[model samples]
Target: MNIFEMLRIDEGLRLKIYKDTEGYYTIGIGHLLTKSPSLNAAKSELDKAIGRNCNGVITKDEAEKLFNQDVDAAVRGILRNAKLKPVYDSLDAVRMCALINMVFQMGETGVAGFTNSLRMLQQKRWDEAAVNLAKSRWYNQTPNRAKRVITTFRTGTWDAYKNL
Candidate 1:
């Protein structure tokens, strides 16, 4: 599966606006309108999803469109980073998706802060990379998802995500 398919399952869809675990205003497939680049656009998009559920509600197709944009931004964020780009390019697609999955949720800076883990990943030290990933608060905050991402990194396969 591509990154989008993986994220569709990992992030899941929500037609209405709600606070995420971190208490940020989110909508669609984990779209954080709270941090949206433009408040006007965010509100406009939220209006589409606010079908009388305080904010409204959105169609599945609309959610998918927003998800696509989010994933594309994550991909670009990963590619544009000097430290992340070469490592990203060297990885197989599955492992690449693992990285993007982390970025999709944690943001580029969050992943970039994992310097030792990134070095381990760059050198193909799979187990070490996995261990380092598990060492973070991100893992503690979302163990199931973090474990899946770490397993993908360690095994270089989608087996960890098969159930999804």
Candidate 2:
């Protein structure tokens, strides 16, 4: 099996529309917010499944392709627009992945709004960065998710937090 098939299994492929763990609309294997796809490449694929309440199933091929396309935009946006370019550019992969995950959930603009958090990151103040993340609305909305990211900030281990 290919890498995406492994992800499809891990992400829990579904043959019908459903709400994700975070209550976002999703289908197939983690194709989220189908109506508001994150990338141009995802647009048509999602349109093919739009309005599918419980009656359609996108192939694993389609799901994986669309998900990666969506992720590419998010990753590119995070890499290109993080306000503290020097800090973000210098981040290790683990920290960068966690930060990119945040940028995916909140746009790069929204991530940039966390000025204090960015400053903490710039200074390599891991504890403070975790503390600041816990104080945000993002944390309030997703405590578990926040904790996972916070742990990554504190320990710089993306593998430990990626599933959350």
Candidate 3:
């Protein structure tokens, strides 16, 4: 069976599977699974799983390094998937970083739930996009972070979301 079939995921949700290994997933991205890659190839294997590369398996002490890189890549991927150019057309580095941080915390599928904001973005209505973003559960759950990010979306500046 394919991983999606083995996991009993519906076709609609199956595109969400990014990491397919164990220690690499856990050590680098905190995803819990049972499939372990050989220790010597863990990082390379994980890079492939997440569609990027790393120098080596990250120890607990080095996990932050992996996370920072992974989150950045995740942002790039999200923008790519949405056909939004990063740091060129639609988003700046800080906005991308904050969006990726939100995705890392919420998971891509969960973050994908913000269809309204995506629609507003597609329409290029910045204020409505920011408002739609702030209307999500994410905003209610992390008000300060959401407010700051939405402000960035509204202002088209990286300053507000730089620290997110």
The top-ranked prediction according to TM-score is: 1
What TM-score does candidate 3 reach? 0.51
After superposing candidate 1 on the true structure, give the runs of residues whose Cα lies further than 4 Å from its correct spot: 35-54
- Compose the digit string of candidate 1's lDDT tens values, residues 1-164: 88888887888788776667776767789888775555455666676544332334677887787888889999999999988888899899889999999899989998899999999999999998899889989999989989989999999988988966
In order of listing, the candidates' clash counts read 8, 0, 0
**lDDT per residue as tens, model 2, 1-164:** 22233234335666555666565567665666544434433444456555342234566666666668756776777667748466677687667766766765666788889998888998899998888878888889767667766787789765543443
**Could you tell me the lDDT of residue 115 within candidate 3?**
71
Q: lDDT by residue for model 3 over 1-164, one digit each (tens)? A: 22112112111121112343212334434432224545535445555645545443434434445445655555566766543342224555444544555565565667767777766765668888887788777788667657765776677565553432
Q: lDDT winner between 1 and 3, please give it.
A: 1
Question: 87 in model 2: Cα distance from truth in Å?
Answer: 3.3
- Give the candidate order by descending lDDT: 1, 2, 3
- Who is ahead in lDDT, 2 or 3? 2
Candidate 2 regions exceeding 4 Å error are: 1-15, 20-24, 34-45, 48-56, 82-84, 162-164
| Candidate topping lDDT | 1
